[PDB]
PDB file of all heavy atoms in Angstrom:
ATOM      1  N   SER A 289      -6.873  -0.929  10.244  1.00 59.12           N
ATOM      2  CA  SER A 289      -7.563  -2.173   9.926  1.00 59.12           C
ATOM      3  C   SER A 289      -6.552  -3.242   9.552  1.00 59.12           C
ATOM      4  O   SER A 289      -5.400  -2.938   9.195  1.00 59.12           O
ATOM      5  CB  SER A 289      -8.549  -2.005   8.764  1.00 59.12           C
ATOM      6  OG  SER A 289      -7.901  -1.766   7.511  1.00 59.12           O
ATOM      7  N   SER A 290      -7.002  -4.484   9.617  1.00 57.30           N
ATOM      8  CA  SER A 290      -6.081  -5.581   9.269  1.00 57.30           C
ATOM      9  C   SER A 290      -5.693  -5.413   7.789  1.00 57.30           C
ATOM     10  O   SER A 290      -4.541  -5.684   7.406  1.00 57.30           O
ATOM     11  CB  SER A 290      -6.770  -6.938   9.536  1.00 57.30           C
ATOM     12  OG  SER A 290      -5.913  -8.054   9.294  1.00 57.30           O
ATOM     13  N   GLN A 291      -6.650  -4.973   6.969  1.00 54.30           N
ATOM     14  CA  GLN A 291      -6.376  -4.741   5.531  1.00 54.30           C
ATOM     15  C   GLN A 291      -5.272  -3.682   5.340  1.00 54.30           C
ATOM     16  O   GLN A 291      -4.300  -3.892   4.567  1.00 54.30           O
ATOM     17  CB  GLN A 291      -7.643  -4.298   4.810  1.00 54.30           C
ATOM     18  CG  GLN A 291      -7.394  -3.932   3.328  1.00 54.30           C
ATOM     19  CD  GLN A 291      -8.651  -3.666   2.551  1.00 54.30           C
ATOM     20  OE1 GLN A 291      -8.906  -2.511   2.143  1.00 54.30           O
ATOM     21  NE2 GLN A 291      -9.452  -4.737   2.309  1.00 54.30           N
ATOM     22  N   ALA A 292      -5.423  -2.543   6.022  1.00 51.57           N
ATOM     23  CA  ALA A 292      -4.420  -1.467   5.926  1.00 51.57           C
ATOM     24  C   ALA A 292      -3.057  -1.959   6.432  1.00 51.57           C
ATOM     25  O   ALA A 292      -2.024  -1.577   5.896  1.00 51.57           O
ATOM     26  CB  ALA A 292      -4.857  -0.215   6.763  1.00 51.57           C
ATOM     27  N   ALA A 293      -3.052  -2.775   7.493  1.00 52.56           N
ATOM     28  CA  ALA A 293      -1.801  -3.303   8.020  1.00 52.56           C
ATOM     29  C   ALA A 293      -1.079  -4.179   7.006  1.00 52.56           C
ATOM     30  O   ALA A 293       0.145  -4.065   6.869  1.00 52.56           O
ATOM     31  CB  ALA A 293      -2.061  -4.129   9.339  1.00 52.56           C
ATOM     32  N   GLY A 294      -1.835  -5.069   6.346  1.00 52.78           N
ATOM     33  CA  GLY A 294      -1.266  -5.975   5.324  1.00 52.78           C
ATOM     34  C   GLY A 294      -0.781  -5.091   4.167  1.00 52.78           C
ATOM     35  O   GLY A 294       0.253  -5.396   3.585  1.00 52.78           O
ATOM     36  N   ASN A 295      -1.522  -4.036   3.815  1.00 57.33           N
ATOM     37  CA  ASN A 295      -1.083  -3.148   2.738  1.00 57.33           C
ATOM     38  C   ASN A 295       0.280  -2.540   3.136  1.00 57.33           C
ATOM     39  O   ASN A 295       1.236  -2.465   2.322  1.00 57.33           O
ATOM     40  CB  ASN A 295      -2.069  -1.976   2.517  1.00 57.33           C
ATOM     41  CG  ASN A 295      -3.306  -2.381   1.800  1.00 57.33           C
ATOM     42  OD1 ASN A 295      -3.332  -3.411   1.105  1.00 57.33           O
ATOM     43  ND2 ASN A 295      -4.369  -1.535   1.892  1.00 57.33           N
ATOM     44  N   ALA A 296       0.389  -2.100   4.390  1.00 56.36           N
ATOM     45  CA  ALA A 296       1.661  -1.526   4.834  1.00 56.36           C
ATOM     46  C   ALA A 296       2.826  -2.534   4.803  1.00 56.36           C
ATOM     47  O   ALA A 296       3.942  -2.194   4.441  1.00 56.36           O
ATOM     48  CB  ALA A 296       1.508  -0.938   6.282  1.00 56.36           C
ATOM     49  N   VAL A 297       2.563  -3.756   5.241  1.00 53.12           N
ATOM     50  CA  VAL A 297       3.611  -4.773   5.197  1.00 53.12           C
ATOM     51  C   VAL A 297       4.040  -5.036   3.765  1.00 53.12           C
ATOM     52  O   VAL A 297       5.251  -5.141   3.493  1.00 53.12           O
ATOM     53  CB  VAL A 297       3.141  -6.082   5.831  1.00 53.12           C
ATOM     54  CG1 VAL A 297       4.253  -7.187   5.653  1.00 53.12           C
ATOM     55  CG2 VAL A 297       2.915  -5.837   7.387  1.00 53.12           C
ATOM     56  N   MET A 298       3.081  -5.132   2.851  1.00 53.58           N
ATOM     57  CA  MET A 298       3.452  -5.350   1.443  1.00 53.58           C
ATOM     58  C   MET A 298       4.266  -4.174   0.895  1.00 53.58           C
ATOM     59  O   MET A 298       5.216  -4.382   0.126  1.00 53.58           O
ATOM     60  CB  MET A 298       2.194  -5.520   0.584  1.00 53.58           C
ATOM     61  CG  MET A 298       1.430  -6.813   0.903  1.00 53.58           C
ATOM     62  SD  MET A 298       2.399  -8.292   0.354  1.00 53.58           S
ATOM     63  CE  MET A 298       1.804  -8.472  -1.352  1.00 53.58           C
ATOM     64  N   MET A 299       3.902  -2.948   1.284  1.00 54.52           N
ATOM     65  CA  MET A 299       4.699  -1.810   0.809  1.00 54.52           C
ATOM     66  C   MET A 299       6.058  -1.828   1.524  1.00 54.52           C
ATOM     67  O   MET A 299       7.103  -1.557   0.909  1.00 54.52           O
ATOM     68  CB  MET A 299       4.008  -0.468   1.089  1.00 54.52           C
ATOM     69  CG  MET A 299       2.773  -0.346   0.197  1.00 54.52           C
ATOM     70  SD  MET A 299       2.022   1.323   0.304  1.00 54.52           S
ATOM     71  CE  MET A 299       1.048   1.113   1.790  1.00 54.52           C
ATOM     72  N   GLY A 300       6.058  -2.158   2.812  1.00 53.68           N
ATOM     73  CA  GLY A 300       7.348  -2.169   3.528  1.00 53.68           C
ATOM     74  C   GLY A 300       8.319  -3.206   2.939  1.00 53.68           C
ATOM     75  O   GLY A 300       9.524  -2.983   2.859  1.00 53.68           O
ATOM     76  N   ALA A 301       7.764  -4.336   2.497  1.00 54.93           N
ATOM     77  CA  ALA A 301       8.577  -5.439   1.946  1.00 54.93           C
ATOM     78  C   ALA A 301       8.910  -5.298   0.457  1.00 54.93           C
ATOM     79  O   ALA A 301       9.571  -6.153  -0.088  1.00 54.93           O
ATOM     80  CB  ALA A 301       7.855  -6.764   2.183  1.00 54.93           C
ATOM     81  N   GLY A 302       8.441  -4.246  -0.201  1.00 56.53           N
ATOM     82  CA  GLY A 302       8.821  -4.094  -1.604  1.00 56.53           C
ATOM     83  C   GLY A 302       7.864  -4.735  -2.596  1.00 56.53           C
ATOM     84  O   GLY A 302       8.021  -4.560  -3.824  1.00 56.53           O
ATOM     85  N   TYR A 303       6.886  -5.486  -2.072  1.00 59.74           N
ATOM     86  CA  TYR A 303       5.938  -6.153  -2.975  1.00 59.74           C
ATOM     87  C   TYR A 303       5.082  -5.196  -3.758  1.00 59.74           C
ATOM     88  O   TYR A 303       4.726  -5.485  -4.886  1.00 59.74           O
ATOM     89  CB  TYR A 303       5.028  -7.128  -2.184  1.00 59.74           C
ATOM     90  CG  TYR A 303       5.788  -8.372  -1.741  1.00 59.74           C
ATOM     91  CD1 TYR A 303       6.031  -8.612  -0.387  1.00 59.74           C
ATOM     92  CD2 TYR A 303       6.217  -9.305  -2.670  1.00 59.74           C
ATOM     93  CE1 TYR A 303       6.693  -9.778   0.039  1.00 59.74           C
ATOM     94  CE2 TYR A 303       6.884 -10.506  -2.262  1.00 59.74           C
ATOM     95  CZ  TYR A 303       7.108 -10.725  -0.903  1.00 59.74           C
ATOM     96  OH  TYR A 303       7.737 -11.853  -0.437  1.00 59.74           O
ATOM     97  N   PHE A 304       4.722  -4.055  -3.149  1.00 63.03           N
ATOM     98  CA  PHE A 304       3.896  -3.105  -3.859  1.00 63.03           C
ATOM     99  C   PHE A 304       4.731  -1.962  -4.441  1.00 63.03           C
ATOM    100  O   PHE A 304       4.219  -0.860  -4.674  1.00 63.03           O
ATOM    101  CB  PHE A 304       2.802  -2.502  -2.941  1.00 63.03           C
ATOM    102  CG  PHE A 304       1.658  -3.452  -2.620  1.00 63.03           C
ATOM    103  CD1 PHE A 304       0.656  -3.031  -1.732  1.00 63.03           C
ATOM    104  CD2 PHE A 304       1.536  -4.732  -3.218  1.00 63.03           C
ATOM    105  CE1 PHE A 304      -0.434  -3.834  -1.434  1.00 63.03           C
ATOM    106  CE2 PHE A 304       0.437  -5.561  -2.934  1.00 63.03           C
ATOM    107  CZ  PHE A 304      -0.567  -5.115  -2.030  1.00 63.03           C
ATOM    108  N   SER A 305       6.001  -2.209  -4.709  1.00 63.58           N
ATOM    109  CA  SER A 305       6.850  -1.137  -5.288  1.00 63.58           C
ATOM    110  C   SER A 305       6.202  -0.682  -6.591  1.00 63.58           C
ATOM    111  O   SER A 305       5.787  -1.492  -7.402  1.00 63.58           O
ATOM    112  CB  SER A 305       8.271  -1.682  -5.576  1.00 63.58           C
ATOM    113  OG  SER A 305       9.141  -0.601  -5.884  1.00 63.58           O
ATOM    114  N   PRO A 306       6.266   0.635  -6.899  1.00 64.42           N
ATOM    115  CA  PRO A 306       6.964   1.714  -6.187  1.00 64.42           C
ATOM    116  C   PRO A 306       6.039   2.573  -5.310  1.00 64.42           C
ATOM    117  O   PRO A 306       6.345   3.738  -5.025  1.00 64.42           O
ATOM    118  CB  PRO A 306       7.582   2.508  -7.361  1.00 64.42           C
ATOM    119  CG  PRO A 306       6.453   2.506  -8.327  1.00 64.42           C
ATOM    120  CD  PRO A 306       5.774   1.093  -8.196  1.00 64.42           C
ATOM    121  N   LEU A 307       4.911   2.034  -4.859  1.00 63.42           N
ATOM    122  CA  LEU A 307       3.997   2.882  -4.018  1.00 63.42           C
ATOM    123  C   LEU A 307       4.690   3.422  -2.795  1.00 63.42           C
ATOM    124  O   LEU A 307       5.452   2.702  -2.151  1.00 63.42           O
ATOM    125  CB  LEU A 307       2.755   2.129  -3.530  1.00 63.42           C
ATOM    126  CG  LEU A 307       1.873   1.554  -4.640  1.00 63.42           C
ATOM    127  CD1 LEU A 307       0.641   0.822  -4.006  1.00 63.42           C
ATOM    128  CD2 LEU A 307       1.386   2.690  -5.539  1.00 63.42           C
ATOM    129  N   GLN A 308       4.437   4.699  -2.485  1.00 62.67           N
ATOM    130  CA  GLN A 308       5.136   5.325  -1.364  1.00 62.67           C
ATOM    131  C   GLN A 308       4.331   5.442  -0.092  1.00 62.67           C
ATOM    132  O   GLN A 308       4.838   5.942   0.902  1.00 62.67           O
ATOM    133  CB  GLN A 308       5.627   6.713  -1.779  1.00 62.67           C
ATOM    134  CG  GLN A 308       6.784   6.562  -2.824  1.00 62.67           C
ATOM    135  CD  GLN A 308       7.983   5.707  -2.310  1.00 62.67           C
ATOM    136  OE1 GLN A 308       8.737   6.111  -1.410  1.00 62.67           O
ATOM    137  NE2 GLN A 308       8.170   4.525  -2.914  1.00 62.67           N
ATOM    138  N   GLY A 309       3.089   4.985  -0.149  1.00 61.63           N
ATOM    139  CA  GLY A 309       2.224   5.049   1.020  1.00 61.63           C
ATOM    140  C   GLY A 309       0.771   4.854   0.609  1.00 61.63           C
ATOM    141  O   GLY A 309       0.450   4.333  -0.500  1.00 61.63           O
ATOM    142  N   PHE A 310      -0.131   5.257   1.512  1.00 62.89           N
ATOM    143  CA  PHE A 310      -1.556   5.046   1.251  1.00 62.89           C
ATOM    144  C   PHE A 310      -2.125   5.995   0.250  1.00 62.89           C
ATOM    145  O   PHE A 310      -1.831   7.187   0.279  1.00 62.89           O
ATOM    146  CB  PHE A 310      -2.304   5.109   2.572  1.00 62.89           C
ATOM    147  CG  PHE A 310      -2.014   3.917   3.479  1.00 62.89           C
ATOM    148  CD1 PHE A 310      -1.224   4.063   4.602  1.00 62.89           C
ATOM    149  CD2 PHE A 310      -2.532   2.646   3.144  1.00 62.89           C
ATOM    150  CE1 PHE A 310      -0.916   2.958   5.449  1.00 62.89           C
ATOM    151  CE2 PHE A 310      -2.263   1.537   3.946  1.00 62.89           C
ATOM    152  CZ  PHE A 310      -1.438   1.702   5.125  1.00 62.89           C
ATOM    153  N   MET A 311      -2.953   5.470  -0.650  1.00 62.91           N
ATOM    154  CA  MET A 311      -3.547   6.278  -1.712  1.00 62.91           C
ATOM    155  C   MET A 311      -4.651   7.223  -1.274  1.00 62.91           C
ATOM    156  O   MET A 311      -5.405   6.942  -0.327  1.00 62.91           O
ATOM    157  CB  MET A 311      -4.234   5.374  -2.755  1.00 62.91           C
ATOM    158  CG  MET A 311      -3.275   4.473  -3.522  1.00 62.91           C
ATOM    159  SD  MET A 311      -4.208   3.410  -4.646  1.00 62.91           S
ATOM    160  CE  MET A 311      -2.841   2.341  -5.264  1.00 62.91           C
ATOM    161  N   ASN A 312      -4.743   8.329  -2.016  1.00 66.44           N
ATOM    162  CA  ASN A 312      -5.873   9.204  -1.795  1.00 66.44           C
ATOM    163  C   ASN A 312      -7.032   8.637  -2.636  1.00 66.44           C
ATOM    164  O   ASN A 312      -6.870   7.680  -3.380  1.00 66.44           O
ATOM    165  CB  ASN A 312      -5.560  10.655  -2.186  1.00 66.44           C
ATOM    166  CG  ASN A 312      -5.067  10.815  -3.620  1.00 66.44           C
ATOM    167  OD1 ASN A 312      -5.402  10.043  -4.513  1.00 66.44           O
ATOM    168  ND2 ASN A 312      -4.270  11.866  -3.844  1.00 66.44           N
ATOM    169  N   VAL A 313      -8.227   9.210  -2.506  1.00 68.87           N
ATOM    170  CA  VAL A 313      -9.365   8.688  -3.252  1.00 68.87           C
ATOM    171  C   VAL A 313      -9.178   8.737  -4.760  1.00 68.87           C
ATOM    172  O   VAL A 313      -9.560   7.791  -5.443  1.00 68.87           O
ATOM    173  CB  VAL A 313     -10.651   9.429  -2.817  1.00 68.87           C
ATOM    174  CG1 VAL A 313     -11.793   9.035  -3.753  1.00 68.87           C
ATOM    175  CG2 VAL A 313     -10.973   9.085  -1.368  1.00 68.87           C
ATOM    176  N   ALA A 314      -8.572   9.803  -5.302  1.00 69.45           N
ATOM    177  CA  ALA A 314      -8.381   9.860  -6.772  1.00 69.45           C
ATOM    178  C   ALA A 314      -7.548   8.654  -7.274  1.00 69.45           C
ATOM    179  O   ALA A 314      -7.905   8.024  -8.290  1.00 69.45           O
ATOM    180  CB  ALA A 314      -7.722  11.164  -7.161  1.00 69.45           C
ATOM    181  N   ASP A 315      -6.431   8.367  -6.602  1.00 66.38           N
ATOM    182  CA  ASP A 315      -5.636   7.196  -7.022  1.00 66.38           C
ATOM    183  C   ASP A 315      -6.386   5.870  -6.819  1.00 66.38           C
ATOM    184  O   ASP A 315      -6.301   4.970  -7.677  1.00 66.38           O
ATOM    185  CB  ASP A 315      -4.314   7.126  -6.245  1.00 66.38           C
ATOM    186  CG  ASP A 315      -3.244   8.059  -6.807  1.00 66.38           C
ATOM    187  OD1 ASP A 315      -3.298   8.432  -7.988  1.00 66.38           O
ATOM    188  OD2 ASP A 315      -2.326   8.381  -6.047  1.00 66.38           O
ATOM    189  N   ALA A 316      -7.106   5.725  -5.702  1.00 68.51           N
ATOM    190  CA  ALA A 316      -7.819   4.470  -5.471  1.00 68.51           C
ATOM    191  C   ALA A 316      -8.903   4.278  -6.537  1.00 68.51           C
ATOM    192  O   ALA A 316      -9.140   3.179  -7.014  1.00 68.51           O
ATOM    193  CB  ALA A 316      -8.408   4.445  -4.079  1.00 68.51           C
TER     194      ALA A 316
END
């Protein structure tokens, strides 16, 4: 999804540091 893509770009660019990838339901 466009949302997931933007989430990936933010993680790739360091904005969402220190997340290492997509969350499971418990973390979300």
